[PDB]
Design a protein around this ligand. Sequence first.
Ligand SMILES: NC(=O)c1ccc[n+]([C@@H]2O[C@H](COP(=O)([O-])OP(=O)(O)OC[C@H]3O[C@@H](n4cnc5c(N)ncnc54)[C@H](O)[C@@H]3O)[C@@H](O)[C@H]2O)c1
Ligand SMILES: NC(=O)c1ccc[n+]([C@@H]2O[C@H](COP(=O)([O-])OP(=O)(O)OC[C@H]3O[C@@H](n4cnc5c(N)ncnc54)[C@H](O)[C@@H]3O)[C@@H](O)[C@H]2O)c1
Ligand SMILES: NC(=O)c1ccc[n+]([C@@H]2O[C@H](COP(=O)([O-])OP(=O)(O)OC[C@H]3O[C@@H](n4cnc5c(N)ncnc54)[C@H](O)[C@@H]3O)[C@@H](O)[C@H]2O)c1
Ligand SMILES: NC(=O)c1ccc[n+]([C@@H]2O[C@H](COP(=O)([O-])OP(=O)(O)OC[C@H]3O[C@@H](n4cnc5c(N)ncnc54)[C@H](O)[C@@H]3O)[C@@H](O)[C@H]2O)c1
Lengths: 244, 244, 244, 244
Amino acid sequence: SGRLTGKVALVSGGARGMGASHVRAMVAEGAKVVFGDILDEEGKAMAAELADAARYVHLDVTQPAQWKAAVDTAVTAFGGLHVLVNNAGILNIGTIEDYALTEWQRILDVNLTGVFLGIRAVVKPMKEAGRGSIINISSIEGLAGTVACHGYTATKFAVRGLTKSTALELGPSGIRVNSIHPGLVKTPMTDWVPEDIFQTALGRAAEPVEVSNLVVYLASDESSYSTGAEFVVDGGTVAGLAHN
Amino acid sequence: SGRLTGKVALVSGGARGMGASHVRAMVAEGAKVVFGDILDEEGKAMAAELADAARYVHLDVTQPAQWKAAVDTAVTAFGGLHVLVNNAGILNIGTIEDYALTEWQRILDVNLTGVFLGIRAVVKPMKEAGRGSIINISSIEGLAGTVACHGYTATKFAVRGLTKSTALELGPSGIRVNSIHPGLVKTPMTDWVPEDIFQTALGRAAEPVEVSNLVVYLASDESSYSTGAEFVVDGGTVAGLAHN
Amino acid sequence: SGRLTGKVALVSGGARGMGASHVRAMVAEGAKVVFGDILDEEGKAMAAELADAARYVHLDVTQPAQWKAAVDTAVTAFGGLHVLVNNAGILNIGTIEDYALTEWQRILDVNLTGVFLGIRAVVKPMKEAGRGSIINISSIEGLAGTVACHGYTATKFAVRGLTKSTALELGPSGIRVNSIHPGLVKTPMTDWVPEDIFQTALGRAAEPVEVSNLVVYLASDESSYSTGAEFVVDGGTVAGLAHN
Amino acid sequence: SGRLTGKVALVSGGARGMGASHVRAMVAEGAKVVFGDILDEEGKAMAAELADAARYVHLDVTQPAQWKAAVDTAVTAFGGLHVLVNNAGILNIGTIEDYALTEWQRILDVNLTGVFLGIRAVVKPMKEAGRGSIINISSIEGLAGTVACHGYTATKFAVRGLTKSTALELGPSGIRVNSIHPGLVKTPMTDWVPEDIFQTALGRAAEPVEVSNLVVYLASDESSYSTGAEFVVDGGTVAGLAHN
Ligand SMILES: NC(=O)c1ccc[n+]([C@@H]2O[C@H](COP(=O)([O-])OP(=O)(O)OC[C@H]3O[C@@H](n4cnc5c(N)ncnc54)[C@H](O)[C@@H]3O)[C@@H](O)[C@H]2O)c1
Ligand SMILES: NC(=O)c1ccc[n+]([C@@H]2O[C@H](COP(=O)([O-])OP(=O)(O)OC[C@H]3O[C@@H](n4cnc5c(N)ncnc54)[C@H](O)[C@@H]3O)[C@@H](O)[C@H]2O)c1
Ligand SMILES: NC(=O)c1ccc[n+]([C@@H]2O[C@H](COP(=O)([O-])OP(=O)(O)OC[C@H]3O[C@@H](n4cnc5c(N)ncnc54)[C@H](O)[C@@H]3O)[C@@H](O)[C@H]2O)c1
Ligand SMILES: NC(=O)c1ccc[n+]([C@@H]2O[C@H](COP(=O)([O-])OP(=O)(O)OC[C@H]3O[C@@H](n4cnc5c(N)ncnc54)[C@H](O)[C@@H]3O)[C@@H](O)[C@H]2O)c1
């Protein structure tokens, strides 16, 4: 408790799923949170329960003008911005032949370009404060491949890399950038996926808050000497070899 | 020798630099090679001195229709297509703030989408033959980040990932997919870069043929059990820690 | 505050350096701690200031008999054991030609075998509890190589691997196993090394507590979905490429 | 092909399995080979059918005296030594509790220490010719973990790390050091393991010659710019995520 007191955060895709969980988890730790999404109804609903500790803003991560407005909201409403959780994302699938180029561009736009636009938007106020933490949501798909999951895999691997280059550049400014790589988590993005799809050591899928606990750690000053690194939260899947 | 005798390859960005070196190396090994680029003048000159062993085609890797045409050329002129070297690529630099969104889009288009488009085009002929080897040129920049190199890092990491997902999917078809990660190689892309810019164990930059040797190996059947893997040829850079 | 309440831990090599920091940090979070070492004077000294929540024990990690005694102490004194921090370790250097084979054997004994012995000694009480967290101290030297640092490098890579095998096996029992990889940290092991020997994004060496924060997080149930994973805390070093 | 014509190689554990395969392949590629093992009968037998190009010696990789004897045999009989294939290794298994401490020590001595002893023994003759290729045999178990396979996993990870530390140190002398990581390979070490035990993209286990082709490539000058790197030949296992 109070581990994020004094900190202001911006969470992309915070209307439902893990994003919503991160928003609630950080507020519970004393942070003021601005969260954006395209699901206005849902966003305005939780904005009501959170009250003065949060602010919902419509934010299409592929739109730089919208990122700017979301950032202006945080600075003005809460006095500044110290944390960015690039959580917004989508999932599409298809074989090398059946996957539509439009689906490919679309996922590149949201999962990759959107993360980059988030970073470009938050660097000024973060650099002014002298201390910031950027948390990019990748996945274990950003560590290994999956059949018929080319666009998703390509972008999650891309985010993994963007984390490293930006961490290196922003380090001197007092800004840390790390990537989170989870296994299967219970959210609307995977409710159609069997919960034991991956071979985990823990024998179960993850609850969103289990990833939020990691978001809180990386957002806090507790992880002050960690940057440009991959934090895996997958129940052990990537720790072992794929066995039949 | 004839390490590639009987094989047909398609090399993007083969008008100069490493690509050109790959084309010459494979032809020397008995392979028939169709190489494409946007530098037609230089490309045609090469085709001239390579006579029947090769064909130059104009190929902008961001254009799917051009990939289709390149593949048709390889099939009609040589009867098949067994190897693809996704070598075409560009490098642009810039800090998070100064970097142009147009530079970012263009590098994603060339280095990432272009690689995916090549794969899409070569799978029909390869799948019908029941074998093939796709070689994606990533870089050690696809293994770690670099200051003001966000567009390049992100795409090289993405290529690294795409290699894995496509390899898992194409395995059952008898097609292998691997990624090559070279360090500094002497080519026009880096002639403005100091040869000893990386901390290497060998104490020198790479000659383009040294990477071509790796291309020939992955293209030949002597790498029949390797797929979805990263083959590093950087003189030892990523094997060590960045010291001051 | 109380993030580790009700948890009993065992820290090897906790008489000074990071080990001591870990003891202090965890006690501050409500944990009862038994810590062993071979520096009895220093061990008894700090055990005096933490007398109510901690217990010192002489423990040579190469001696399984001493590991068992360290465990019985934790179980009888505090009622059980839920956390193990395999922190004890040594550093020796030397070229391939001059490195003494006795030094090589010695470092494998302490740094590697010692880690495995600890795990063997804590699994029973942990399984009996149905919940536990094993934290193995590797290093960035366990992620890449270093000249004249063969024994340390090999052992640190070995810990990284042992972390994974034991994690997969212990997962079904409710026990998580992870490894920490820090960069240069200010401790007596490094008093002789310039604080800026590594190329870091943060431009400074680490403070032992900065690593203890990670130990705290991995010891708590907050990291419940993380097992078999590598947690890097190196100021960004391995995130970039080694430059001259 | 005469791909290794003129080079002299020393192979440990070459009396059967992959070791024998490597010997035969290298000799077939025009190389002179000195291969050691503890199975003298089998060693002397295949040395009789290779005669004009190979020399079998008794070599227990745990004894530096025998390593020195093997090395001197290569030099005196073939005039030098340019290639070392650290192939000797053993496999034992057991859960954290049942695993005998004697099995742990034994596999450390043979799998890790033996590899190190091999390197120590060959550097002098390689440093005189300012050229050398050291090929250490790791495994995909040196990349991820396996239940009840702690000694094996640890040592294979250790070999992976030792490869990098030594490569960095030997680079200035023109000596390359790389590690090979194969998946399931049909040899007497795993004739009790179902061939489809691993999730591969290729849908089969490897023939030992498929790994030998990789040893030849690394032994050849065609890999001149690769050192301290990991060469995976596992049919795709590690490129994918463990599924159920
Ligand atoms: N669900 C999983 O198992 C899992 C595993 C690893 C990683 N992830 C990643 O975690 C993130 C969140 O996943 P989730 O499980 O909550 O999925 P989700 O579908 O529940 O939520 C994603 C959210 O992003 C929002 N969003 C989508 N496109 C957007 C855009 N252009 N602009 C702004 N917001 C947009 C969606 O409306 C939604 O609220 C994604 O990056 C996802 O790839 C999920
Ligand atoms: N030079 C290095 O040190 C180094 C290190 C690692 C990786 N690489 C990679 O190797 C590849 C070749 O690099 P290089 O060093 O020879 O660079 P290069 O500039 O000499 O050659 C790249 C080639 O790609 C062609 N090309 C560019 N855009 C294209 C497009 N849209 N369609 C088709 N062709 C296009 C260029 O005209 C050129 O002939 C690139 O993917 C590069 O990123 C280079
Ligand atoms: N100092 C660094 O920069 C750094 C970086 C990465 C990892 N590490 C690791 O962190 C751990 C602790 O490092 P440190 O910096 O505090 O070193 P340190 O020398 O201060 O402490 C190591 C401790 O282990 C104890 N010890 C040594 N041999 C032992 C044995 N056989 N049995 C029991 N205890 C034994 C020592 O007496 C000492 O208290 C080690 O595993 C080290 O490899 C240190
Ligand atoms: N079989 C596989 O699937 C597989 C997969 C990855 C890695 N490997 C590795 O490849 C190497 C060879 O494996 P293999 O499949 O041929 O096993 P193998 O049992 O057939 O051969 C290993 C050889 O090493 C020799 N040897 C054992 N201890 C020795 C010692 N102390 N001194 C000298 N020689 C000794 C044995 O007599 C034997 O001929 C080992 O390092 C093994 O761990 C094997």
